[PDB]
RNA sequence: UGGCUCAGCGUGUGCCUACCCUACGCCGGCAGGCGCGGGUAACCCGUUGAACCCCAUUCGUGAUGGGGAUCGGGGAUUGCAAUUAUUCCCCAUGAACGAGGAAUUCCCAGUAAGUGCGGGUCAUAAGCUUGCGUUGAUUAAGUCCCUGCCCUUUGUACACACCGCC
């Protein structure tokens with residue numbers, strides 16, 4: 018607990034983790050992915066809307082402060 | 093061995109206590125046994141008829 | 157109440173006693189609570205008697221003739 | 227100034243009254259000067275009667291009382307508020323305060 | 329039926345204890361479209377009961393100076409958070425709120441003026457009305473403190489505070505201080 | 518950063534006394550400048566297009582795009598005079614400061630607080646004060662515990678009155 022030194026740009030070891038396990042749990046937001054994958058958070062907002070364009074993640078709120086996404090429905 | 097948490101219903105308000113008004117003292121009847129009734133000092137706003145939790149049966153009873 | 161129940165006792169004859177002698181004859185606040193809890197814990201109460209030492213005339217009371225100044 | 231014609235004590239035809247001890251602070255006070263209480267209190271609380279009556283083996287069990295005779299110096303009597311300083315006119319009467327029975 | 333925030337019908341939620349049934353305002357009489365009303369709730373004693381509890385949380389969520397009048401921001405954070413807890417639990421957000429409120433309000437405390445051992449002297453059980461008021465304040469402070477210097481926003485931090493309070497895992501600041509108050513009261517019996 | 522979108526007090530050309538409030542057009546990036554005007558005022562400024570807030574962008578838990586202290590250079594306005602920088606603008610530096618000990622202030626409903634706008638001061642001007650408006654709560658409907666106040670009783674060796682006397 019001194020400094021986050023988060024990931025401004027992706028690498029292969031984390032990009033695949035984004036592609037396989039991020040769109041699997043109920044609540045995905047740029048804050049949650051930033052703290053979980055230790056990415057910056059600006060990269061989190063960009064990558065989340067990239068997965069929005071790919072269509073595997075559904076958006077609900079779309080606010081300037083609190084933009085909220087979710088996994089696809091299963092079943 | 094251990095007395096469980098219960099509830100009691102306020103019947104009448106007796107008056108403030110604690111020499112600050114931080115506590116009010118009211119009489120509570122027992123919902124489990126209506127004949128059983130004690131007097132308890134409580135904090136926060138209390139009016140007539142409300143039911144509140146009581147973690148222990150008998151602690152204190154004094155007349156002001 | 158627990159020890160008496162596990163030893164086979166169901167009723168009690170309470171014998172109150174204050175400090176006695178030339179000292180205080182009023183039992184403290186623990187008299188009411190202990191007596192009340194014995195009956196409420198599921199035990200019977202019979203005869204209650206006082207064994208507080210009440211002298212005819214005792215010795216000199218500790219404190220001095222000017223009392224305990226406070 | 228002679229405050230009380232009674233001189234604060236009941237000694238009228240005597241010359242000396244044997245002392246007692248204050249039940250609170252253990253101060254030697256003359257017997258006729260110390261304020262005397264005689265309290266006939268219930269041996270149980272005013273709210274513990276109902277609980278004992280359930281556990282009493284005798285259905286018609288009379289409730290024993292407590293007989294305590296208290297003696298107080300005027301220091302302990304005033305400190306415990308059992309007596310109070312009264313006005314010049316109100317000092318003279320000797321009637322006990324009302325019992326507030328009803 | 330009233331569709332608070334446009335959804336989350338209030339007819340399925342219920343209070344699992346009668347001591348707080350008559351002081352929480354999730355009922356149909358106090359079922360409101362939006363948690364925003366200037367109904368003069370401080371005019372008289374015993375009038376904050378009929379004030380809707382969703383509005384009560386909105387009132388208590390603005391503090392610490394920078395946020396003392398802004399209610400549009402507070403309502404939008406509550407709107408985000410209730411949708412978030414719905415997405416994370418799958419039940420009514422109001423049922424999460426009632427579970428959190430009951431499980432956060434400390435049932436005992438201590439307060440005296442004389443000599444005190446550790447904090448206070450004599451143990452006194454609290455009122456149901458003080459139970460709710462302390463519950464909402466403890467939840468708001470828990471969300472604010474967790475969100476003060478981290479990347480998680482107010483809506484998310486308020487969400488996990490009420491979610492951990494609804495279950496009970498000694499991670500909610502509201503239930504953490506609740507247990508501390510109960511233990512202190514037990515010692516000061 | 519861009520867009521959206523709502524106030525109310527009140528002032529405005531002067532005896533001496535010189536010093537008004539400003540719509541619009543054009544020039545400049547800005548502070549500013551030049552000409553047409555209006556208003557001695559519910560007539561004009563002015564539907565006072567205020568701020569906050571709201572809606573989108575970027576930032577992403579680091580003394581960072583927080584903060585703007587200190588300091589260099591340059592340009593205007595007011596005044597006769599701007600250095601010890603009057604005020605304002607632009608480009609430069611980016612200091613402490615991560616919620617602050619003992620203590621202590623104020624406060625009960627359109628209240629605190631956030632937030633701007635008029636007046637007074639003024640040739641130049643507000644971090645001051647006096648009023649106005651927007652958003653708007655938590656707790657409390659009690660007590661004499663602390664700090665005090667009133668009435669009665671009481672004691673006093675006090676009367677410059679307990680910060681007394683001795």
Ligand SMILES: [Mg+2]
Pocket residue numbers: 226
């Ligand atoms: Mg004394």
Ligand SMILES: [Mg+2]
Pocket residue numbers: 227
């Ligand atoms: Mg005298």
Ligand SMILES: [Mg+2]
Pocket residue numbers: 241242
């Ligand atoms: Mg003699």
Ligand SMILES: [Zn+2]
Pocket residue numbers: 223248249250251252253298299301302303
């Ligand atoms: Zn004595």
